[PDB]
Amino acid sequence: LINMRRYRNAARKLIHHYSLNSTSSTEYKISDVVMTMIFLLRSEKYHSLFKLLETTFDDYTCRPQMTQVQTDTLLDAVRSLLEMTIDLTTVDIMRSSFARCFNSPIMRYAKIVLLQNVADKRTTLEELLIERGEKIQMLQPQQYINSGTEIPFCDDAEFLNRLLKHIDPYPLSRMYYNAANTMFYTTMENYAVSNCKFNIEDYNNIFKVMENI
Amino acid sequence: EKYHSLFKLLETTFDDYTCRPQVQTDTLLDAVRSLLSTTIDLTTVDIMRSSFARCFNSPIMRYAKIVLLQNDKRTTLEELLIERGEKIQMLQ
Amino acid sequence: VRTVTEIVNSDEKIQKTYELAEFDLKNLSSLESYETLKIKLALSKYMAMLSTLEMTQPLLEIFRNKADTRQIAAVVFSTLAFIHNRFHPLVTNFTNKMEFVVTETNDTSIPGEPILFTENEGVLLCSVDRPSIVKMLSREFDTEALDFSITEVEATQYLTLLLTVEHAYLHYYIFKNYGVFEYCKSLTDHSLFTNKLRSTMSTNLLLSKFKFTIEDFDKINS
Amino acid sequence: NKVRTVTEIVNSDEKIQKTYELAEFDLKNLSSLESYETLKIKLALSKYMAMLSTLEMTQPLLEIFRNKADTRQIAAVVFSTLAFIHNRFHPLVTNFTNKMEFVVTETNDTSIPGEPILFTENEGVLLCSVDRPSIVKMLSREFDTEALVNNCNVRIAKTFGASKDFSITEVEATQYLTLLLTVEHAYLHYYIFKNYGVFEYCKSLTDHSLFTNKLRSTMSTNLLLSKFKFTIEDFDKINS
Amino acid sequence: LFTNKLRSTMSTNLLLSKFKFTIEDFDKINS
C-alpha cells in the first residue's frame, strides 16, 4: 500500500499553489505531481476531481461540462481537500495549471508562466475600463459619510506601544513579500477571469515609479 | 497488479532514492520482460528505478513570483538641531 | 580619503587613512534599522486607528461580510484619510461628503484596480469590489520564508490593505489634482505617477522602502 | 503645448512656476463643443417633431408613408420638412414659392436609386418627386438602437469624467433623423437647382462633389450631418 | 568584510599572511 497522509498533503500543497491562495512560493517536481495525482486517484470522495485531472491530461482546449450537482460535489470535495471561499474560477485555474503542467515535458528547470487559457472572448484593457465605468456609474451609492468626519486617530499611546512590541518580532520584510505576491496574484486573477491582456509591464512600471519617487 | 512490487519500489524512490532490499524477483523480472523481449536482471531493474527516481525529483513548470530585493539626501544641521533641542526641552 | 596629523615642530607625521566604506556601512545599517522602525510605527498607529474605528470583528471578515457595508464605507474612508494624513501630516479631516458603492461581481470588478473613484456630478464615489479584495486577503501567506492578540499573518493583511488603499489613493490624487483625463491615463499607465509625484510628493513613500520585481519578467513578457 | 505661468511677489525674488498642460483644457473645449452640438441637434429634432405633431399627424410617420391614399398628408409633411430645412439654412425665411406641387413615385419604373426624392420644374414651378416605396422600405428597415457605434485613452477619459411623457422610443428618433438627412440631401440638390439652373442641378446630382463648390461658398458660412464624419468600413480596400 | 574592518586595527599581526593561498584548478573548476 501507500501512505495516505503524504499523498493527501502533496495534493493539498499543489492545489494551494495553483489556486494561488498559497502565496508561499515553493518548488515542485514530477514527484509532487505524481503524489498529488495518486491521491486524487485513490480518493473516492475526490474521484470527480481525479476525472477532471484526467480530462486536463487530454487536449485540455475545451473544459468538460458538468451538471450542477456535479459542480457542487466538485466544490465540496475540493473544499474538503484544501480544508477551507472556493468557487468555479479556482477550478478553472486548477484545470489550466494541471493541463499546462502535463504539456511540460521532462525538464531540468521550471518555465515561469502567467495565467491564461481561462475565460473565451479576448478583451482589451481600455474598453474593459470603459465597460466597467458603464456598470459602476449606473449604480446609486448606498453609503453616506456626512460632515468633515474627523479621522479617528487612536491616541491610546500605550496601545500603540503594545501593538508595536507585539508586532516587533515580526519580520517586516516577509510581510512585504507576502502582500506584494498577493497583490500580483489578485492582478493576474482579475485580468485572466475578465480575459483581459494582463499588462504586467505597467504592473512593473508601478514599482519603477515607487523606486524613482 | 502484476507490477505492484516495482510500483512500491518506485513510490519509495521518490524524494530520496532510498535503496533496494527470490521468487518475487523472478516475478518482477518476468513482468519487466513482458513490458519489454530482451533478457534482464536486477541491474537494469535498478537502472530503470533510478531513471524513474530522478524523473520524479526532476523540476516542472512553475509560475512567477514577486521577488523581494533588499535595497543621497542628507538632513541639514538646522532641522536636526531643531528636533534635538525640542526633545532636550521636553526633558525634565 | 586620508587624514594627516603631525607634530608641527617636527618632521614626524602620523598619517591615518580613513575608509569611507566603513562609514557608508554604518550609515546604511542605521538607515535600514530606522526605516524598519518607522514603518512598524506607522503600521502600529494604523492598527490602533482601525481599533478606534470600533469593530470587534476582524478585518478579513470585516470584508467577507456582505450585509455589513456601513462599516465597509467607514473603514475605507478611514484608510484613505489616514493615507491622506500620512502624505499630508497637517490634514486630519477629509471632504465633508463621501459616498461608497459596493460592487460584488466580475462584470463590476475592473481587473488590477478593484478600488476606484468617479463622480456623480456632486461627490466622488468609492467603487469597491468586495469579492476581489476578500479573495486577495484570503490567500495563505509565506509568513515563514526569507496583550492584544495579533499575528504576523494579520500584519501581512494590514500591509496588503494599506498598499491597496495607497495605490487607490494615488489614483484618486491624480483624479483630484489633474482631472479625470489624467486619472484615466494614469490608470492606463502608472509610469505617469512618476511624473505626477516627482512634482508633488517627492518635494516619502512606504513602498519605496523596497524595490520589487517579478521573476523571469523578461521572458514572461515574451 | 505647455504654459508655465509665473506667480511671484515683486518685494522679493521669490518666484513660483506652474506648467499647464493645454491638452486638458482643449479636451474641455472639445467636450463642451460635442455637448452643445448634441443639444442643438436634439433640439432641432424636437422642434421638427413638435411642428409635425402640430401638423395634425395622427398616425406616426411610418404608416403615414404606408398610406398610399392620403397624398394630402404626404404633400403636407414633405412641404413642412423642406420648410424646416430651409429655415435651418435661412432662419429669417419661413415661407416658400406661393404655388407648390407634389408627385409620388410608386414603382421602380418611377423611382430612382440614390435620390428617391427629386425635382424637375414644369418650367413654371417646381414639382416634388417623392418615392413612397423607397421611404416605406427605409423605415421598415429593422434598426440597431442598442449597439453603441464609435483615441482609446481620451475615450476612457470622456467615459469616466462623464458622470453618468408621450409614447416615443428611440426608433422613431432614428426614423426622423433619416427623413431629415434624406430631405437635407435632396434640398441641397434643389438649392443647386434654384441657384444655378436645371443643368447644374443635373450635374450636381451626377456629382455630389459639386456641392462642395457651391456650398463651401454658402452653406459653410453648417450641416446637421457635419456634426460627425462618415465613411465606409475599410473604405480603402473597398475602393480597390 | 574582514579586510575592511581590520584595516583599522590589524594593519597597526596575522600569521596566516605569510604564504599565498588559493584553491586548486579554478581555471577548470569555476568553468
Asked if C46 and C80 count as a contact pair (C-beta separation under 8 A), the reply is no
Residue type at position B44: T
Chain-chain contact of C210 with B70 (C-beta, under 8 angstroms): yes
In the numeric block, which cell numbers belong to residue D176?
426622423
In the numeric block, which cell numbers belong to residue B92?
525634565
**Is the CB of residue B73 less than 8 Å away from at least one CB of chain A?**
no
Chain-chain contact of D159 with A130 (C-beta, under 8 angstroms): yes
Across the interface, which of B11, B60, B64 has its CB nearest the CB of A33? B60
Chain-chain contact of D156 with A126 (C-beta, under 8 angstroms): yes
Residue of D nearest to A138 (CA): D164
Name chain D contacts of C179, Cβ cutoff 8 Å: 24, 161
Cα dihedral sign for A181, A185, A191, A195?
positive
Q: Is D3 helix (H, G, I), strand (E, B) or coil?
A: strand
Q: What is the 3-state secondary structure (H, E, C) of chain A?
A: CCCHHHHHHHHHHHHHHHHCCCCCCCCCEHHHHHHHHHHHHHCHHHHHHHHHHHHHHCCCCCCCCCCHHHHHHHHHHHHHHHCCCCCHHHHHHHHHHHHHHHHCCCCCCCCCCCCCCCCCCCECHHHHHHHHHHHHHCCCCCEEECCCCECCCCCCHHHHHHHHHHHCCCCHHHHHHHHHHHHHHHHHHHHHHCCECCCHHHHHHHHHHHHHC
* Residue from A137, A138, A196, A197 whose CB has the most chain D CBs within 10 Å, to mutate: A137
For chains C and D, CB pairs below 8 A equal: 34
Distance CA(E25)–CA(E31), nearest Å, equals 10
The CA-based angle D122-D125-D130, given to 5 degrees, is 75
**Is the CB of residue C61 less than 8 Å away from at least one CB of chain E?**
no
Tally of helices (H runs) and strands (E runs) in chain D: 9, 5
Between the CA of residue A32 and those of A1, A25, A201, D27, what are the distances in Å?
18, 14, 32, 57
Across the interface, which of D24, D152, D163 has its CB nearest the CB of C181? D24
Distance CA(C29)–CA(C32), nearest Å, equals 5
Name the residue with cell 525640542.
Answer: B86
Task: Report resolution in angstroms.
Answer: 6.1
**Is the CB of residue B88 less than 8 Å away from at least one CB of chain C?**
no
In the numeric block, which cell numbers belong to residue C183?
486619472
Distance CA(B92)–CA(B89), nearest Å, equals 8
**Is the CB of residue D22 less than 8 Å away from at least one CB of chain C?**
no
Q: How far apart are the first and last CA of chain D?
A: 40
Name chain B contacts of A35, Cβ cutoff 8 Å: 14
In the numeric block, which cell numbers belong to residue D98?
406661393
Residue type at position D45: L
Q: How far is D155 from chain C (nearest CA, A)?
A: 9
Name residues whose C-beta falls within 8 Å of residue D107's C-beta, 6 or more positions apart in sequence: D133
Which subunits sit against D, judged by 3+ Cβ pairs under 8 A? A, C
Asked if A40 and A53 count as a contact pair (C-beta separation under 8 A), the reply is yes
Chain-chain contact of A31 with B65 (C-beta, under 8 angstroms): no
Distance CA(C163)–CA(C142), nearest Å, equals 18
Q: How far is D150 from chain A (nearest CA, A)?
A: 12
Distance CA(D23)–CA(A97), nearest Å, equals 45
Distance CA(D81)–CA(A69), nearest Å, equals 63
Distance CA(C105)–CA(D67), nearest Å, equals 51
Residue of A nearest to C211 (CA): A211
**Is the CB of residue C181 less than 8 Å away from at least one CB of chain D?**
yes
What technique determined this structure?
cryo-EM
Q: Is D234 helix (H, G, I), strand (E, B) or coil?
A: coil
- The continuous run of DSSP H or E covering D51 comes out as helix D22-54
Chain-chain contact of D159 with A134 (C-beta, under 8 angstroms): yes
Interface of A with D (CB under 8 A): 126-127, 129-130, 133-134, 137-138
Report strand pairing: A143-145 vs D15-21: unpaired
Cα dihedral sign for D29, D30, D34, D37?
positive
Name residues whose C-beta falls within 8 Å of residue C168's C-beta, 6 or more positions apart in sequence: C80, C113, C115, C116, C117
* Residue from C110, C119, C180, C192 whose CB has the most chain D CBs within 10 Å, to mutate: C180
Q: Is C5 helix (H, G, I), strand (E, B) or coil?
A: strand
Asked if A touches D (at least 3 Cβ pairs < 8 angstroms), the answer reads yes
Nearest to C19 by CA among E5, E2, E10, E1: E5
Asked if B15 and A32 count as a contact pair (C-beta separation under 8 A), the reply is no
Nearest to C159 by CA among E28, A175, E4, B7: A175
Residue type at position C12: E
**Is the CB of residue E22 less than 8 Å away from at least one CB of chain C?**
no
Exposure string of D51-76, with b = 16+ CB inside 10 Å and e = fewer, is ebeeeebeebbbebbeeeeeeebbbb
Which subunits sit against E, judged by 3+ Cβ pairs under 8 A? C
Asked if D138 and D117 count as a contact pair (C-beta separation under 8 A), the reply is no
In the numeric block, which cell numbers belong to residue C42?
506607522
Report strand pairing: D118-119 vs D127-131: antiparallel
Distance CA(A39)–CA(C47), nearest Å, equals 42
Distance CA(A78)–CA(A52), nearest Å, equals 12
Report strand pairing: D101-105 vs D127-131: parallel
The CA-based angle D73-D77-D80, given to 5 degrees, is 140
Cα dihedral sign for C103, C108, C112, C115?
negative
Between the CA of residue C165 and those of A133, C113, C172, D98, what are the distances in Å?
19, 10, 10, 73
Residue of C nearest to E12 (CA): C16
Nearest to A91 by CA among A55, A39, A59, A45: A55
Residue of C nearest to B64 (CA): C215
Residue type at position D107: T
Length of chain E: 31
Nearest to A125 by CA among D27, C114, D153: D153
Q: What are phi and psi of D20, to 5 degrees?
A: -130, 110
Q: How far is A119 from chain D (nearest CA, A)?
A: 23
**DSSP assigned state of C206:** S
Name chain A contacts of D153, Cβ cutoff 8 Å: 126
**Is the CB of residue B59 less than 8 Å away from at least one CB of chain A?**
yes
Q: After which residues is chain E broken (C to N over 2.5 A)?
A: 12
For chains A and B, CB pairs below 8 A equal: 72
- The continuous run of DSSP H or E covering D31 comes out as helix D22-54
Distance CA(D151)–CA(D102), nearest Å, equals 47
Residue type at position C66: K
**DSSP assigned state of C18:** -
Q: Any bridge partners for residue C3, and if so which?
A: C16
Q: Classify residue C78 by burial, with Cβ atoms within 10 Å: 0-12, 13-18, 19+.
A: buried
Residue of A nearest to C48 (CA): A154
* Residue from A7, A14, A29 whose CB has the most chain B CBs within 10 Å, to mutate: A29
Name residues whose C-beta falls within 8 Å of residue A28's C-beta, 6 or more positions apart in sequence: A14, A17, A110, B59, B60, B62
